[PDB]
Design an enzyme around this catalytic site. Structure first.
Site, PDB file in Angstrom:
ATOM      1  N   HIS A 106      81.162  -6.095 -28.558  1.00 55.38           N
ATOM      2  CA  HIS A 106      82.485  -6.103 -29.198  1.00 55.38           C
ATOM      3  C   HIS A 106      83.143  -7.474 -29.117  1.00 55.38           C
ATOM      4  CE1 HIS A 106      84.056  -4.380 -25.153  1.00 55.38           C
ATOM      5  NE2 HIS A 106      84.615  -5.570 -25.272  1.00 55.38           N
TER       6      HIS A 106
ATOM      7  N   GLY B 221      90.430  -8.537 -20.463  1.00 59.42           N
ATOM      8  CA  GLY B 221      89.603  -9.653 -20.105  1.00 59.42           C
ATOM      9  C   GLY B 221      88.464  -9.347 -19.152  1.00 59.42           C
TER      10      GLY B 221
ATOM     11  N   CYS C  47      86.029  -7.124 -19.547  1.00 58.98           N
ATOM     12  CA  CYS C  47      84.804  -6.619 -20.149  1.00 58.98           C
ATOM     13  C   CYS C  47      83.663  -7.599 -19.925  1.00 58.98           C
ATOM     14  CB  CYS C  47      84.970  -6.345 -21.619  1.00 58.98           C
ATOM     15  SG  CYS C  47      85.922  -4.868 -21.894  1.00 58.98           S
TER      16      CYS C  47
END
Ligand code: YVJ
Ligand code: YVJ
Lengths: 304, 304
Positions: free
Chosen positions: B41, B143, B145
């Site tokens: 993503h 932030g 991920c």
């Protein structure tokens, strides 16, 4: 979102852990630049437990009597001295993995990360608070002495604890890295008792703010109190008195949530007097006191 | 003595963390040999998130659309591909800090450590369990991920989790390092719900053994039970069924305490049917289920 018992990343400390053996006794040391720091009781035997003559024990030792290994690889000791309850072994190789560091003494109620180690090999990392009675509720077995506690401030590793002993009550005591014990403890095997422990009020309030930040608000009503009225209740439940300084340090959390500090004090007063009535807060059925205001911020803000 | 939520030392993983930026969007990556792994993503924008057409988005990008940084050094991207829900960015330099590693898929009820990172910089480490409904109760902010979960088996890092998203209920979902989600979840911003969660019975029993090892014995009763009888009680209280392999995994703890597993089951049956009565076990007023039998052994025996 979420809230966990979070320790600092331990890599900078892992690279400093060594094993120190004197005779039959092995424990951990902290290798920074060209010095290894460890508990001085490594030079003892069982005959010395009640009244160790540490200066006598050290005079009989040469540099060759200390076996220092880093990852099971021997470093050569070239000098040795004593500072309070810590031995300082100068070695002929400086640690190329030494982080920027400082030796700090923490205040009761403050938290730190512990790197639990055995025979110079790290086993795990967990978070600990310095209790108001200057013990820590750690997790340590035979072989763990010389394990250290630390915080990371900016990019500096602030070492604050070196492990020495366990009291019969199952709690732990140790020194700063200059070898001075926290609390009324000594490194001889006299029967030693900690004072009655108390609950770290400012930390419970910080944790209640963490719950609000994470949406767990059921204990929040629009109540408020005065500092004196709150302290009259706190003392009935073995909580530390709350000072205006503690109120001030909770500022950032009050600022984020919009809940005044004395409103949170009123919520805590209600939780103490009426209990939690089967409910949980942040997954706990008890009021938790081992997160500082800074711990909550750092976790609810993502500082690196 | 003592028992804490203890994570694995994180240094071997810290050396693998990088920052990945695609346009305006930045998250963490894992750098192993000359590949960087991260959530796919990173290639999305706002309008993509309902139904991101990840194949189109990826094929239309060039290597120069990806900015990978290890600390402050840029790693030049020389290829980009997708495996399930993870992006693999081939870079022109192999990570000199690459540990011995494996990619493993963990089963429900097993625990791992999470190194929470932001912009490629490690912030903290904590211990997590894969819940039976294939979510984790983590601590993640925007932030985070690309942060990973891992276990350390010997000196090999077993990576098992990479973080992707938070469900509205406050729990977390992600993938293994092959990019396959745990549970039924998908990397689209759609209403997704985790199935009912259950309590991890074998872990509660391991924690009761940890309590006995630490001297908490008030909840022990003289009765025994059978696996079949106990499992009728488990299902009443939304506990996972206990299997014979679970009984056998508890054998090392039974051997250390001398308490047969089926005796401990009988003690747990009473705790479920009556609660704790304002008493505590290992400093908790709830039955804890995020320590595996190995976590208790490793901690109560000093595995490094
Ligand atoms: C570390 C010793 C070590 O690793 O070196 C050789 C292997 C060890 C840690 C504890 C063992 C179990 N859990 C622990 O936290 N410390 C000791 O064994 C300690 C040695 C010592 C230190 C200072 C004065 C006297 C002895 N001994 C103890 O902890 C036991 N509990 C005896 C004791 C000592 C001091 C007290 F106040 C009460 C009890
Ligand atoms: C990591 C995203 C990141 O770092 O990218 C840099 C811009 C982040 C972690 C969560 C943020 C707050 N706490 C977290 O755990 N993930 C997201 O923000 C995620 C992006 C995403 C991933 C996969 C499909 C769709 C969107 N979005 C969310 O987590 C929110 N909660 C929306 C959402 C997504 C999927 C669901 F099943 C429910 C809700």
């Amino acid at each position: 979102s979420g809230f966990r018992k979070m320790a600092f990343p331990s890599g900078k400390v892992e690279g400093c852990m060594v094993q120190v053996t004197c005779g039959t006794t092995t424990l951990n040391g902290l290798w920074l630049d060209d010095v290894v720091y460890c508990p001085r009781h490594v030079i003892c035997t069982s005959e010395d437990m009640l009244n160790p003559n540490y200066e006598d024990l050290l005079i009989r030792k040469s540099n060759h009597n200390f076996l220092v290994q880093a990852g099971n690889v021997q470093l050569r000791v070239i000098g040795h001295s004593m500072q309070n309850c810590v031995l300082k072994l100068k070695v002929d190789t400086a640690n190329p993995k030494t982080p920027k560091y400082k030796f700090v003494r923490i205040q009761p109620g403050q938290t730190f990360s512990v790197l639990a180690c055995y025979n110079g090999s790290p086993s795990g990392v967990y978070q600990c608070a310095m209790r108001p009675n200057f013990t820590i509720k750690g997790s340590f077995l035979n072989g763990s002495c010389g394990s250290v506690g630390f915080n990371i401030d900016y990019d500096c590793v602030s070492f604050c604890y070196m492990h020495h002993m366990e009291l019969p009550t199952g709690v732990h005591a140790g020194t700063d890295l200059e070898g001075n014990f926290y609390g009324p403890f000594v490194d001889r095997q006299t029967a030693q008792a900690a004072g009655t422990d108390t609950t770290i009020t400012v930390n419970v309030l910080a944790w209640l703010y963490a719950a609000v930040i994470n949406g767990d608000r059921w204990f929040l009503n629009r109540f408020t109190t005065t500092l004196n009225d709150f302290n009259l209740v706190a003392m009935k439940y073995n909580y530390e008195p709350l000072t205006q300084d503690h109120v001030d340090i909770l500022g950032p959390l009050s600022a984020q949530t919009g809940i005044a500090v004395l409103d949170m004090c009123a919520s805590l007063k209600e939780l103490l007097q009426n209990g939690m009535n089967g409910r949980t807060i942040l997954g706990s059925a008890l009021l938790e006191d081992e997160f500082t205001p800074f711990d909550v911020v750092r976790q609810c803000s993502g500082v690196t």
